[PDB]
């Protein structure tokens, strides 16, 4: 009755699964060039650094 409530509850714990998502949100009103120059920067700065 103590260690039961001491244990927190979860649901479907996370594994590796080999995939990852990156989400980019430029400030509102910006064009696709301003978003693209951030996106290719963030792939080129974590394609060889990782």
């Amino acid at each position: 009755i103590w260690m039961f409530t001491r244990i927190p509850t979860a649901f479907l714990p996370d594994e590796d699964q080999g995939v990852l998502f990156a989400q980019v949100q430029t400030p509102p009103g910006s064009s696709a060039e301003r978003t693209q120059v951030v996106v290719d920067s963030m792939r080129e700065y974590l394609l060889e650094k990782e």
Partner: protein, 50 residues
């Protein structure tokens, strides 16, 4: 015969059960469960406009 002016709008409108709504998502606290986290939501819901 035509002028213009700048207004302030939303680029993504959304509806739930055929009525206008907005959608909020998040995670529970690190170490806390989802039951008490969802219990830590509806006490804020009374602090809304009618």
């Amino acid at each position: 015969f035509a002028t213009g002016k700048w207004e302030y709008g939303s680029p993504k409108l959304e509806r739930y059960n055929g009525v206008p709504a907005m959608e909020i998502l998040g995670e529970p606290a690190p170490g806390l469960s989802s039951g008490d986290a969802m219990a830590a939501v509806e006490e804020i819901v009374k602090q809304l406009p009618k």
